[PDB]
Design a protein around this ligand. Sequence first.
Ligand SMILES: CCCCCCCCCCCCCCCCCCCC(=O)O[C@H](COC(=O)CCCCCCCCCCCCCC)COP(=O)(O)OCCN
Ligand SMILES: CCCCCCCCCCCCCCCCCCCC(=O)O[C@H](COC(=O)CCCCCCCCCCCCCC)COP(=O)(O)OCCN
Ligand SMILES: [Cl-]
Ligand SMILES: [Fe+3]
Ligand SMILES: [Fe+3]
Lengths: 312, 311
Amino acid sequence: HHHHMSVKVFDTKEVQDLLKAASNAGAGNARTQQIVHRLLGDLFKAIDDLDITPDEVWAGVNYLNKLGQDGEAALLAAGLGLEKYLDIRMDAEDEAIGLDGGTPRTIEGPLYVAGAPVRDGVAKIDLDADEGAGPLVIHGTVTGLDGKPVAGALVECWHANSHGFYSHFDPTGKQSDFNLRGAVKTGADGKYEFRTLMPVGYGCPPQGATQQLLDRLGRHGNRPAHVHFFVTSDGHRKLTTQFNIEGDPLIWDDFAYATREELIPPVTAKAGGAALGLKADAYQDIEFNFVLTPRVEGKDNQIVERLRASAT
Amino acid sequence: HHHHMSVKVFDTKEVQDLLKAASNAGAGNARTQQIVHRLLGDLFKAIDDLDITPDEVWAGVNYLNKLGQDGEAALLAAGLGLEKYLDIRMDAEDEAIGLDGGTPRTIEGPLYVAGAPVRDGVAKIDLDADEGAGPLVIHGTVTGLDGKPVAGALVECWHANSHGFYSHFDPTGKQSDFNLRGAVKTGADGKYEFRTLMPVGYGCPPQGATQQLLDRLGRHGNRPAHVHFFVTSDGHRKLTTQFNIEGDPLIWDDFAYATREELIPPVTAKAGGAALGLKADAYQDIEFNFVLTPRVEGKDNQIVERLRASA
Ligand SMILES: CCCCCCCCCCCCCCCCCCCC(=O)O[C@H](COC(=O)CCCCCCCCCCCCCC)COP(=O)(O)OCCN
Ligand SMILES: CCCCCCCCCCCCCCCCCCCC(=O)O[C@H](COC(=O)CCCCCCCCCCCCCC)COP(=O)(O)OCCN
Ligand SMILES: [Cl-]
Ligand SMILES: [Fe+3]
Ligand SMILES: [Fe+3]
């Protein structure tokens, strides 16, 4: 409660012996031992430097229990910019080898669901009534770096409803499996099209551990309205990206730091929606093309494996 | 698969800007911002230096989900030596100012339960039958640094059964509330005594997150047989300590790094348990005295507040 000087122990042989024992550095997976030794040592050193008290350490330890009970570790990874950091490093790798000329990547987020039924060329993906969102058409072409259309590319799409909730993750009810999620296989013309409704921005669960820490930091936990994409096709690297809805006031204040200048396409007002199966004549239209990068020596060294949900 | 040079982006302006934004370090709690800025920046820098891949990062992220789901964050804190590290730092504090003369501290561990009924001088704490454990008597005096008995000290004791399980945390069933957990208030002579059963060493839940990571590090998750104590007294600092059962082959291979050479008292065989209320005539006996350290200006600046179970 009263300030005192930190007593420094990190460089002592006892602490260094403890770090080597606990990480088992130098059976066991050597790479995991190496990573643990470095992260544990950095934590010990930070506790020494900032005089992080046992009360503070146990608050952090018990915070991790709540974070996992909430299922929110990946949400915090986005909120603390760790997920953006991974893109920064992948972007720097692409810049060094000259693979940075396609549509830019941005974060995947934690809300992808595998298994959407694949449609030929066009998918209508709003399965459930949403009185609060107007119809939205997203369309474009999948091309390579040379401008030619990519046949048989798989474009997957997911976004939120007018309350900012995703199917499979709705805390107010159970949406239909794959509501506002689709997948289209492009034809020879490389064209894809999604017919859906306009999303609104996401907000962290207000009593969740992510928002609790953000609240303590003085930060909001909101995202601007956006739509996610995967684009997969042989001969190209797997594209993970997004675009933001034009004009959202949170576009340059995303709590997950995912907005990119090239990922803010214009939205157009259009008519004749009924002829497209849309629920209203006037609709908003976004033209967005995906420019892919090629595999190098047949390899995609930036595809990411992580725990992902799946549905019927 | 093939080796390449790790990209270095940490010292770029974009990363430094991202770190300041994410920690908000520069509304909010300044101390939390400071700690987050440091811990998050260290993590980014570690990712650069070791070229930690996204696949690796996400495995750690999803591991954290499992760790919290299992409710094991504090178990891993002990298993990775973090809990011992906190004691190393408190011990160095005491040494610097000359408060290091008493019974040594060691780790609390995550299995304390508040509320044991305070008995006078002696508590019998084995409520549940355990055919795998013989009787154990633990007895001693609570004194200050000057050797005078401390009257009214509260000595709390908790430990495992012969399967290595604690009441309130037993995976094979439900023990009685406060089984193998006791509280004793010393009288004028400073003496305490617990009548209990002999513990067996603890092992991490085999399918839990802590053992999963220890397995990946090539480490076991076992503790020697031991007994925990709190000693709370109005004029002294609160002592958190333990002792290990003499002769346990894991005394010098504790996965939580909590063994101290001053905390391994002799065990002697005795007879006469019936008159003590023990379930058998023959029993094992441990004399263990607590030497407390005084408060400074009536304050205890080493007492630890953390989430604790109660019953
Ligand atoms: C560094 C190399 C890599 C190793 C680490 C890898 C992970 C680093 C990731 C980037 C940094 C993220 C840090 C996350 C932990 C922050 C915990 C704050 C949560 C919190 O609200 O604690 C409050 C107390 O704060 C306080 O007392 C002050 C802040 C608390 C200390 C936070 C750090 C503790 C370090 C030990 C935990 C292990 C690391 C954590 C990831 C609440 O307190 P309350 O009890 O009133 O609760 C009331 C609510 N229910
Ligand atoms: C509780 C108090 C004490 C806290 C300790 C904090 C100090 C840091 C020191 C320890 C922290 C380590 C945390 C876990 C890292 C390793 C977890 C991996 C365990 C594991 O089984 O993953 C394997 C791969 O490991 C790997 O690939 C290596 C993964 C290493 C990741 C390191 C970076 C993670 C950063 C996360 C911090 C996030 C902060 C904000 C959320 C297998 O993987 P699998 O997928 O095949 O599993 C399917 C089953 N075999
Ligand atoms: Cl129990
Ligand atoms: Fe999203
Ligand atoms: Fe224990």
